[PDB]
């Protein structure tokens, strides 16, 4: 065989190394390695539980918001605090708007250049490109004139000889299948995406106080002061401003990102047949709407051996079956204690000894669910929603499939979603459904304030003796996230984050079983082993975040 | 015309400092990379990966020797001979020192690279240090915050490009236009502080009237920054205190990530 | 669905109060007139003129009797039997009183209609008065400023539409969310005032460091408003003091248009 | 024959009545009347010269900035103050950006509905509409999809039965000549114009402190504190933000407003043969760039009897020939003193006595230049620039003519510019040239600050005895503006504003000569005297502002 290393993998968050053994041009075995560690779990220990969220939010600035929210949920779980419903609405708006920015940026800024060839775009006929989208999209920025302006921007950049982020890209690679016109469409949409994600983060900022790294949470609720009639606080004028940005997101998401997802799939049909990382999938319900940390707008659950018909629903973040099944191992990771650990009993003792193919090769731990490897993230999330019979998810998937069918003449079956392109599709479906979450929760907030409820915060008490444990779940852009806090004598005595990219990117586990990234790469064809674009295509589909994976 | 080159290296970074650029409006990130600069190395956005991106770095370091701005986010871990951040099989500190040799200007964006930040807090598991500590012979321009308003960085770069020199800096090498004053010495809730009008808990009457957040732990009295004036995201009215939460001191070494949220600040 | 009707009448207006709507963002003026309200009468934008537009007004006053919001900008001149503002051959005061009879809510937008404003200043050549003075038995909601931030008006209308009643008002019938506090009691330059750090002339060293503008004539100490918090134009950081000029007191009767720019304010 | 009144004239600023005698289907005689007076000249009397600008800016909120700038220039003239060049750059950026907003709104929000029929737009084929603009415009928002969304907004408004601003418009009138498709184009651009004008006013706001009604001026310069390194002042970050908005204006101005101007002319070519208001034209030079209140980027001058070849240039705001020629009469206005008055000696004594066709019928005074009636504004401004041989003006007019030529096969000669459409063209040309003013003056400011000049303000001294006379000229959106201040014993002893709409809208003068509005209407065909659309078409071409005209 031949041995390759991809280090750094770019167009992800953080520091990732992928190694592959290749037999006759096909990947036979792979290794995923998180190459940077900070020890964020140890940094947050020995502090007041109320301080954790501001510190652990810095696990990641791409998935900003998520660790902050999981951390407060974990402390609220330990303390037995019920969050005010207005605080839920605000947390939910933040998470949904953040995730909208996150997914858009992943499809375009992080992923599109695996599939799109800018040199080819320069050969495109802008009028033919626009004509291809007639009756496929109603987006208002698909004209030949838009596409010509974009084409000229690329032309000028290439002519300058300063290609910057485009230098030494995979132009002309045999796995680039789009015609010139579709390459140009995608570049125009890449630039347009940046405006939409900026509007999504204007929603986040107006409730969070800024983004990246929101600053409006508390153990016990939120720091926003609701007062329709107050100067300098969250009044009707501020809420109207929030709404103005919420309303700007839908058209791009529905008429550009959703459509491009179908278009990419239509030109890359073999990518429906590779990149399967697991047979088990987990997601948690998300967007609670009652006064007791439940009544979620999105459902969760556990699928085993790809059988949607017999999946197990998860409707509560206190589900003991979910809680008891989660463990992590460091057998093949650079930590000392190797046997599977439940996170309330977890340790994170660094034990770096260099790379070994059969020993330790990553700072990522290996999570299991009752001893099994599990994929988390948008593919899991979509499959669980389909298993739940969620009509909104089936209808949204059906809209993508209809565009694909118009382009190819073929439908897509659920079996074809266990793949690199299925994973991308699940992310798009999520982004689309999140726009209704935003409208729903904005309306809920306006209505509730109108009933006279301005409450936002329940002040915690933290017993100064005793030892007690909490867990905060959250369905993050990359999948199920959980923060596990132990409090002893009023301070954090243990803190363990089990992060979605930990599930997917973790190395071989205590039983030497292969997790999703490594499994997904078996069978990948590699036309040019010096330029393994095909490997990066599959890895990018999981939206790696290695600051998240390792922390 | 040719554009000034920039090389961006992330060490123990959460990527929030790069992400700040995606909120910027003057310039937007697309205009930054197509019009203002040539971003010759940035792993978050680079089409090339692996050996191709390492070639891009080597080529840019040679082609633009003496001319590029080097930017680093994240802290640099020195414990155990640098192994807590390894890229292409080498400690990140080695990549940074190599790139610093040829830099025309060197910028630490964010509190992590400016002074160690969150990654160097508590027990400091990795022996994380600042960019200035790893480059003792160089003048590192510090743009702290977690992350800073992106224009604190962008206007610093613009000053270098337009006027041929860095902006004026304070004694921590922070640009004075952004870090020259304590937040509390330019905060719109100072009248409330002066009158003893204080929020005592989130959601209380004073909080719901926009009163001063000192007694919730506001660190404005001991944090230099422009958060109350420039604020964030260019929509108007958006910074932590205006939203209802105390400043945490994230800009300022010894304050953010060291003092508790609700611990009171010292007032000069 | 049907939209709530609005009738807008200009008296001795400069049109700046209508023009404020063209800077609004939440809603933009186009979303205001297509989605939020039905603007049944507004002479600046109406396709119809002359007899056709007087037809529109009378049809709307009848169709929407008891339902429309009446908005007036400009002062109302009572001297010499109303002849200083004549529309379709009749004094504007008569047009306003007729429209007021069927109004569900009545808003004086701008200082001119709220309290007479500049048009009633000095010797008051035309006997200009406020809308409340012309309508003594009606509750007039006052939204002063010259012109106000348009959202001081738009969020008042939105409160009426969404919740079925006006926002809470102070004793001058001004919405508290926008006028409930003195500018000086929520001004980011208060620390400089407290320290005696004052600009003495435009362009001097303190002015060029953003110090307090009290000794240039700032009327913030005697003007209610939200200019330092909501500010203007939704770009961030934009209000007169932040740009370098004292508040003139344009919101506040007896201050704006009465006191000189550089005359000092009384401090409470 | 019969007598009609148009009261109120809508889609102007302020309160205007137009009366016309119609004989044999054509206007034979007209009266223009400003029906509201405030006495702003009296309100500002007896005050400190430094206070005037904040008061008299309130003459008008449509042409905000203009009276503020003219007032400080008048005090500076009386006092012999040379304005710092940085203050000139800032004043210039404000005026140019303001005027961009002003002209765009005039063409679209105020004027388009004289020429555009929204009912017909509902019949349009959006694809045919988009196709009509190929090779006429490169604007990126002319797609069928954009036009369909706009058409559906109109459709929904009409369907609701609540037409609001569009109710009882002149739909189906025989003078409406656009095909359905061009009506739809125009409505789409009407909506898009609102975004461009908003960006223009963001420029104004960042230097003015807000708009409407800027607050950064002073007798002696500006209140902006220039300090690249200062927190809270006009630093490089703030300048960069200003520039980001300046850059957003050009494409709409060049690709939409300029093109629509030619399109309207192409469909309404008889409107090049009517609406002449005068044979004499006046403009003042504008945008001073030296340290002594001169070196204007735009030229001024006086044209007599339409003879461009023998025009008199005006290069200085201290030109005694300009100053000495200006007088106003109130013979046919509601003021007491009727003989022509030079403005330093002007009075404004109200003397309302009702309407008389042959007596007094307006609050507008009647200005003359050496005893002649004169048109001011964009037509004057363009014709003077052409007389000066200004290549930028020639070239910009030629671009409009070239679109007109492509659409009609016909050309346009200067003689055809003395007309309703020529006046509209002059305004569009001005808006286009103003974008280069903005780029030029932003760059000049950045360059000058880089030389170490941060000066912005020269504190005035005002002698406590003596009588000092000053005049501040300004080329406003609607034409030459002048404020005339007399200082005696330290205070304003006389204040007279002579405003561009005073020149154009003023009633018959001391010699009973007819001013531009009234002259321009002679010969207007009126198909339906109850719905005199044709009269309003010509009046709107002057961009009336009656708060300005009367003050
Ligand atoms: S400064 Fe803050 S946002 Fe920037 S890398 Fe460090 S933790 Fe992340
Ligand atoms: S303590 Fe904080 S909120 Fe209060 S005045 Fe100071 S900086 Fe502002
Ligand atoms: S309040 Fe000011 S802006 Fe409004 S009409 Fe009066 S003068 Fe004009
Ligand atoms: S005087 Fe004016 S600038 Fe100074 S603190 Fe008061 S309101 Fe602010
Ligand atoms: N999404 C996200 Fe980040 C990861 N993996 C978290 O949690
Ligand atoms: N433009 C403008 Fe207003 C008028 N007429 C002024 O001056
Ligand atoms: S926490 Fe940081 S972002 Fe500003 S408000 Fe305080 S320095
Ligand atoms: S002059 Fe007016 S706009 Fe606000 S800053 Fe003062 S009340
Ligand atoms: Cl409330
Ligand atoms: Mg089972
Ligand atoms: Mg962990
Ligand atoms: Mg001086
Ligand atoms: Mg006058
Ligand atoms: Ni992450
Ligand atoms: Ni005007």
């Amino acid at each position: 065989s031949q041995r390759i290393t991809i280090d750094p993998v770019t167009r992800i968050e953080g520091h990732l190394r992928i190694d592959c053994e290749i037999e006759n041009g096909v990947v036979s075995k792979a290794w995923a390695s998180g190459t940077m560690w900070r020890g964020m779990e140890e940094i947050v220990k020995n502090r007041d539980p109320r301080d954790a969220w501001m510190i652990v939010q810095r696990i990641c600035g791409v998935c900003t918001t998520t660790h902050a929210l999981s951390s407060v949920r974990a402390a609220e779980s330990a303390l037995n605090i019920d969050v005010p419903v207005n605080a839920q609405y605000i947390r939910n708006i933040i998470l949904a708007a953040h995730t909208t920015h996150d997914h858009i940026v992943h499809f375009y800024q992080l992923s599109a250049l695996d599939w799109v060839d800018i040199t080819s775009a320069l050969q495109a006929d802008p009028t033919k490109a626009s004509e291809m989208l007639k009756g496929v999209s109603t987006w208002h920025l698909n004209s030949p004139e838009e596409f010509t302006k974009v084409q000229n921007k690329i032309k000028d950049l290439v002519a300058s000889g300063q290609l910057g982020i485009f230098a030494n890209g995979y132009w002309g690679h045999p796995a680039m299948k789009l015609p010139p016109e579709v390459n140009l469409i995608a570049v125009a949409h890449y630039l347009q995406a940046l405006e939409c994600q900026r509007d999504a983060n204007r929603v986040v900022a107006l409730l969070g106080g800024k983004t990246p790294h929101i600053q409006n949470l508390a153990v016990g609720g939120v720091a926003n002061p609701i007062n329709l009639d107050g100067l300098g606080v969250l009044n009707l004028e501020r809420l109207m401003y929030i709404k103005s940005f919420i309303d700007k997101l839908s058209d791009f998401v529905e008429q550009v990102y959703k459509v491009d997802t179908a278009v990419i799939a239509a030109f890359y049909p073999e990518w429906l047949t590779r990149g399967k990382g697991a047979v088990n999938y987990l997601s948690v319900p998300e967007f609670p709407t009652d006064s007791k940390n439940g009544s979620f707008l999105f459902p969760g659950g556990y699928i085993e051996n790809a059988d949607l018909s017999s999946y197990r629903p998860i409707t509560s973040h206190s589900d003991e079956y979910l809680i008891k099944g989660i463990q992590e191992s460091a057998k093949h990771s650079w930590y000392k204690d190797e046997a599977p650990q439940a996170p309330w009993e977890g340790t994170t003792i660094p034990a770096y000894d260099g790379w070994s193919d059969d020993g330790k090769y990553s700072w990522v731990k290996s999570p299991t669910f009752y001893g099994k490897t599990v994929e988390v993230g948008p593919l899991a999330n979509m499959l669980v929603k389909l298993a739940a019979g969620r009509e909104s998810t089936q209808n949204k998937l059906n809209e993508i499939v209809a565009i694909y069918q118009k382009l190819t003449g073929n439908t897509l079956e659920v079996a074809q979603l266990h793949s690199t392109l299925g994973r991308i599709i699940g992310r798009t479906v999520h982004c689309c459904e999140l726009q209704d979450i935003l409208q729903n929760q904005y309306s809920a907030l306006i209505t509730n304030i109108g009933k006279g409820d301005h409450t936002t915060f329940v002040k915690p008490n933290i017993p100064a003796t005793g030892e007690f444990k909490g867990v905060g779940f959250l369905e993050a852009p990359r999948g199920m996230l959980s923060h596990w806090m132990v409090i002893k004598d009023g301070i954090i005595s243990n803190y363990q984050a089990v992060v979605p990219s930990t599930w997917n990117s973790g190395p071989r586990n205590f039983n030497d079983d292969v997790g999703p990234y490594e499994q997904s790469l078996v069978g990948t064809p590699v036309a040019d082993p010096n330029k393994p674009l095909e490997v990066v295509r599959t890895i990018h589909s999981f939206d790696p975040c290695m600051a998240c994976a390792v922390h | 015309p040719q554009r000034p080159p920039v090389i961006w290296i992330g060490a123990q970074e959460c990527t929030g400092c790069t992400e700040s650029l995606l909120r910027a409006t003057h310039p937007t990130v697309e205009n930054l990379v197509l019009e203002t600069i040539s971003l010759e190395y940035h792993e978050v956005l680079s089409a090339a990966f692996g050996h191709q991106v390492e070639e891009n770095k080597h080529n840019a370091l040679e082609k633009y020797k003496g001319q590029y701005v080097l930017v680093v986010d994240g802290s640099i871990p020195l414990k155990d001979n640098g192994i807590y951040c390894m890229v292409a099989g080498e400690p990140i500190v080695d990549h940074i020192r190599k790139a610093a040799e040829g830099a025309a200007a060197i910028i630490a964006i964010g509190s992590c690279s400016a002074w160690g930040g969150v990654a160097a807090a508590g027990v400091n598991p990795t022996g994380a240090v600042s960019l200035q500590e790893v480059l003792p012979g160089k003048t590192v321009i510090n743009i702290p915050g977690c992350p800073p308003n992106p224009h604190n960085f962008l206007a610093t770069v613009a000053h270098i490009i337009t006027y041929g020199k860095p902006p004026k800096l304070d004694d921590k090498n922070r640009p004075t236009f952004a870090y020259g004053r304590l937040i509390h010495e330019h905060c719109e809730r100072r009248p409330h502080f002066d009158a003893g009008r204080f929020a005592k808990e989130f959601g209380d009457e004073g909080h719901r009237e926009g009163w001063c957040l000192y007694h919730l732990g506001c660190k404005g009295p001991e944090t230099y920054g422009n958060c109350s004036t420039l604020q964030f995201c260019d929509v108007g009215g958006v910074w932590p205190v205006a939203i209802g939460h105390p400043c945490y001191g994230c800009n300022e070494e010894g304050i953010g990530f060291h003092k508790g949220i609700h611990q009171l600040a010292n007032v000069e």
Side-chain angles (χ1 to χ4, degrees), chain A, chain B:
Chain A
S1 61
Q2 183 173 351
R3 177 53 169 264
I4 60 163
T5 190
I6 312 175
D7 185 352
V9 178
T10 55
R11 280 180 296 118
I12 62 165
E13 188 296 324
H15 299 290
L16 178 65
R17 166 176 169 180
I18 293 282
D19 280 29
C20 300
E21 266 170 2
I22 301 177
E23 290 174 343
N24 308 320
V26 182
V27 174
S28 52
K29 184 173 182 177
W31 292 260
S33 180
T35 62
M36 185 278 279
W37 179 70
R38 282 165 298 154
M40 301 291 291
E41 292 156 331
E42 189 59 40
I43 289 163
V44 77
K45 279 170 51 189
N46 283 301
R47 301 175 187 259
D48 190 304
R50 291 175 297 159
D51 291 332
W53 74 264
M54 274 293 287
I55 294 164
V56 301
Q57 188 170 199
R58 277 65 179 175
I59 286 169
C60 189
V62 174
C63 66
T64 191
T65 88
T66 67
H67 295 282
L69 287 163
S70 179
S71 183
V72 296
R73 288 174 177 182
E76 292 154 356
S77 159
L79 295 164
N80 191 22
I81 295 168
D82 289 333
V83 173
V85 73
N86 287 324
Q88 298 291 26
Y89 301 147
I90 287 166
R91 286 178 180 192
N92 289 344
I93 292 162
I94 288 168
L95 177 60
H98 169 75
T99 300
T100 300
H101 141 86
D102 200 328
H103 289 345
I104 288 168
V105 168
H106 183 254
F107 184 91
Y108 289 100
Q109 283 62 54
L110 306 180
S111 296
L113 297 178
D114 292 346
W115 309 98
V116 167
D117 176 343
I118 65 159
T119 299
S120 178
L122 287 180
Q123 297 306 114
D125 173 332
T127 298
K128 288 183 208 123
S130 181
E131 189 68 22
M132 272 177 113
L133 297 175
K134 295 294 163 193
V136 179
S137 176
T138 64
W139 178 233
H140 73 152
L141 277 170
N142 280 332
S143 66
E145 293 71 17
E146 175 71 355
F147 293 166
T148 301
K149 177 175 38 93
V150 168
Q151 195 176 56
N152 290 337
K153 282 167 145 303
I154 305 164
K155 190 167 325 223
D156 288 350
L157 176 127
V158 168
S160 81
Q162 301 182 291
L163 270 70
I165 72 185
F166 301 99
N168 212 2
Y170 300 94
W171 321 129
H173 188 284
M176 285 294 185
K177 301 204 169 335
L178 299 179
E181 283 66 38
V182 184
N183 287 307
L184 178 61
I185 288 164
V187 178
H189 294 168
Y190 173 113
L191 293 169
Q192 294 161 9
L194 286 168
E195 181 73 26
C196 184
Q197 66 82 33
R198 268 194 296 276
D199 283 331
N201 274 339
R202 292 174 177 121
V203 176
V204 176
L206 279 158
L207 290 168
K210 60 198 179 74
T211 176
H213 293 331
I214 61 168
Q215 199 148 319
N216 74 307
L217 305 186
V219 177
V222 296
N224 307 85
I226 294 174
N227 183 355
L228 293 184
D229 295 298
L231 185 150
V233 302
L234 183 59
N235 58 32
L236 189 57
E237 177 275 328
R238 292 285 81 187
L239 287 165
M240 296 171 65
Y241 200 24
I242 290 158
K243 183 59 153 59
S244 76
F245 294 114
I246 290 175
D247 286 347
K248 288 179 175 175
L249 311 179
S250 177
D251 284 0
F252 178 92
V253 168
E254 281 294 314
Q255 294 309 315
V256 187
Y257 178 17
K258 186 189 77 188
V259 178
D260 281 351
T261 296
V263 169
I264 293 303
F267 283 94
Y268 286 105
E270 289 232 27
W271 294 84
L272 291 163
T273 75
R274 73 191 46 140
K276 182 191 304 180
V279 301
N280 319 297
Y281 297 92
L282 255 181
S283 68
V284 294
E286 189 50 83
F287 303 110
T289 67
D290 69 25
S291 61
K292 302 286 199 13
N293 307 334
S295 302
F296 296 100
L297 295 175
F298 280 163
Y302 179 46
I303 295 165
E304 289 170 85
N305 202 19
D307 181 7
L308 276 64
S309 72
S310 68
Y311 91 118
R312 180 183 187 129
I314 298 166
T315 60
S316 171
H317 287 175
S318 294
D319 186 317
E320 298 194 304
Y321 173 83
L322 170 66
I323 288 165
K324 288 190 181 243
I326 296 168
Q327 300 167 298
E328 297 175 294
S329 173
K331 181 180 180 182
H332 296 280
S333 314
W334 291 306
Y335 309 99
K336 177 183 253 143
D337 296 332
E338 299 184 354
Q341 297 179 337
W344 283 320
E345 286 76 56
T347 66
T348 310
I349 302 163
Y352 186 85
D353 59 3
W355 179 287
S356 172
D357 285 356
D358 294 333
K360 297 175 179 293
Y361 59 91
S362 188
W363 289 105
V364 189
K365 294 178 176 175
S366 302
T368 52
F369 189 64
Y370 293 104
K372 298 185 178 178
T373 70
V374 180
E375 173 167 338
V376 299
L379 180 52
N381 165 299
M382 162 175 76
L383 291 173
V384 163
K385 284 162 182 167
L386 296 173
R390 181 173 167 80
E391 289 179 12
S392 169
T393 310
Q394 181 72 67
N395 291 339
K396 188 56 53 179
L397 175 61
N398 286 351
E399 295 169 3
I400 293 170
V401 174
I403 299 163
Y404 175 89
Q405 186 162 348
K406 204 198 289 213
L407 290 171
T408 66
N410 304 140
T411 192
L412 287 185
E413 298 304 336
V414 167
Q416 291 170 284
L417 297 175
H418 301 261
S419 66
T420 293
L421 279 170
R423 192 173 294 110
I424 291 165
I425 289 164
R427 185 176 291 106
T428 305
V429 167
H430 193 217
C431 194
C432 291
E433 295 198 78
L434 282 168
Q435 306 315 305
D436 291 337
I437 295 291
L438 283 166
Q439 292 293 349
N440 179 298
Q441 292 295 276
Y442 180 82
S443 179
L445 180 60
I446 291 309
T447 293
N448 196 53
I449 296 171
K451 296 186 183 168
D453 181 13
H454 61 248
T455 65
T456 45
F457 176 70
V458 171
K459 188 193 175 47
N461 56 271
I462 307 182
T465 65
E467 186 170 340
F468 60 101
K469 312 176 284 76
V471 57
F473 289 101
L474 182 142
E475 188 68 19
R478 290 159 189 73
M480 176 184 72
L481 172 61
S482 53
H483 282 215
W484 306 72
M485 178 184 292
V486 183
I487 300 169
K488 190 189 164 173
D489 297 338
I491 67 181
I492 299 167
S493 58
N494 203 7
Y495 204 99
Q496 293 289 325
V498 186
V499 188
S501 294
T502 317
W503 290 89
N504 291 340
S505 79
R508 290 166 174 76
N509 69 20
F510 187 74
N511 288 286
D512 306 334
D513 290 317
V514 189
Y517 287 16
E518 291 175 345
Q519 178 59 40
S520 77
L521 289 180
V522 177
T524 305
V526 178
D528 173 1
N530 184 47
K531 295 181 179 183
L533 177 63
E534 302 93 335
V535 169
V536 166
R537 278 179 174 179
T538 288
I539 290 304
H540 282 153
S541 72
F542 288 96
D543 185 14
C545 185
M546 306 308 295
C548 273
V550 174
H551 42 279
Chain B
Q2 297 292 290
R3 292 163 280 123
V6 174
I7 289 170
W8 186 303
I9 295 172
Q12 291 175 295
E13 88 273 19
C14 81
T15 314
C17 288
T18 289
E19 282 281 1
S20 74
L21 300 183
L22 273 63
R23 288 70 163 158
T25 62
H26 51 285
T28 62
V29 66
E30 58 273 32
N31 287 337
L32 174 68
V33 302
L34 295 180
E35 317 281 357
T36 312
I37 63 167
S38 190
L39 188 52
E40 300 278 338
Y41 193 84
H42 199 309
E43 290 184 9
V44 173
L45 296 173
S46 174
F49 52 74
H51 301 298
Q52 290 75 53
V53 84
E54 287 299 347
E55 176 190 338
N56 286 356
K57 195 180 61 169
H58 157 84
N59 291 340
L61 287 174
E62 178 65 23
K63 176 174 180 186
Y64 298 113
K65 183 167 271 293
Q67 302 184 324
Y68 53 84
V69 178
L70 172 62
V71 182
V72 175
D73 54 346
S75 56
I76 299 79
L78 298 185
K79 191 179 290 183
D80 294 325
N81 293 275
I83 57 70
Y84 294 114
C85 185
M86 299 279 287
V87 177
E90 295 185 70
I92 199 65
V93 69
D94 291 352
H95 296 303
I96 290 166
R97 289 195 178 124
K98 170 84 244 191
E101 292 176 11
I106 301 172
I107 296 172
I109 189 174
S111 294
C112 293
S113 59
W115 53 259
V118 67
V123 307
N124 193 354
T126 67
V129 305
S130 64
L131 185 60
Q132 183 64 89
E133 178 157 352
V134 317
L135 305 177
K138 301 295 193 142
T139 306
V140 174
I141 304 166
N142 290 319
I143 308 188
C146 196
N149 180 304
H151 307 95
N152 298 352
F153 167 79
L154 296 161
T156 295
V157 172
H159 195 289
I160 293 168
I161 294 165
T162 296
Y163 295 121
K165 53 186 165 174
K168 294 183 189 177
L169 312 179
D170 66 15
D171 69 347
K172 286 186 177 291
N173 287 333
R174 305 176 294 195
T176 60
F177 80 92
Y179 303 94
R181 179 171 293 147
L182 292 168
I183 288 169
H184 181 80
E185 293 302 309
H186 213 111
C187 178
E188 67 279 13
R189 303 191 177 200
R190 181 61 172 274
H192 305 306
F193 179 92
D194 292 340
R197 285 189 302 256
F198 297 116
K200 303 302 172 63
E201 305 290 341
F202 305 126
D204 82 3
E205 274 191 359
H207 187 238
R208 289 174 69 246
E209 294 303 337
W211 288 2
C212 167
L213 309 187
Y214 178 77
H215 283 289
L216 306 187
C218 187
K219 305 308 190 308
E222 55 193 18
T223 305
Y224 286 88
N226 60 5
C227 300
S228 62
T229 49
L230 187 61
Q231 306 184 346
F232 293 90
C233 294
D234 295 315
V235 293
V238 172
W239 70 289
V241 164
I243 253 64
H245 195 282
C247 175
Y248 181 72
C250 80
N251 282 4
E252 194 71 47
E253 183 179 358
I255 315 299
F257 308 108
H258 178 62
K259 301 198 179 182
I261 295 177
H262 299 303
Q263 179 177 345
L264 304 182
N266 298 312
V267 180
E268 284 181 1

